[PDB]
């Protein structure tokens, strides 16, 4: 499926991100969008 | 680039790894070896 890279993201954000992926599998896709936006927002 | 996948690692483990990975970039290769060990250990 679609892939999302987190280069400019903050490590704490990554932990929170991975936590959200686990909280609800269906949300992972939506979380991927926001998470991906952070890479741009924190870029 | 060599790409690694850790689906077997729990969020706490990935968080621990990501913190250690970030805190010690010089040891990123060695630390990854452990996560790869985890990949097998959590297999």
């Amino acid at each position: 499926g679609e892939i999302v890279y987190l280069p400019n993201l903050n490590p704490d954000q990554l932990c929170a991100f991975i936590h959200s992926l686990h909280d609800d599998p269906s949300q992972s896709a939506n979380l991927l969008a926001e998470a991906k936006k952070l890479n741009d927002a924190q870029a | 680039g060599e790409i690694v996948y850790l689906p077997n690692l729990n969020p706490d483990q990935l968080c621990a790894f990501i913190h250690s990975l970030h805190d010690d970039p010089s040891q990123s290769a060695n630390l990854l070896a452990e996560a790869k060990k985890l990949n097998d250990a959590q297999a």
Binding site: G1, V4, A29 | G1, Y5, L21, A29, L32
Partner: peptide
């Protein structure tokens, strides 16, 4: 360099946490 990324795999797994190691793929 190392990079953390999530792959959309659907299923009950949602996405998979994978990281890149060195340079660019």
């Amino acid at each position: 360099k190392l990079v953390f990324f999530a792959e959309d795999v659907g299923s009950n797994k949602g996405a998979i946490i994978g990281l890149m190691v060195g340079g660019v793929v």
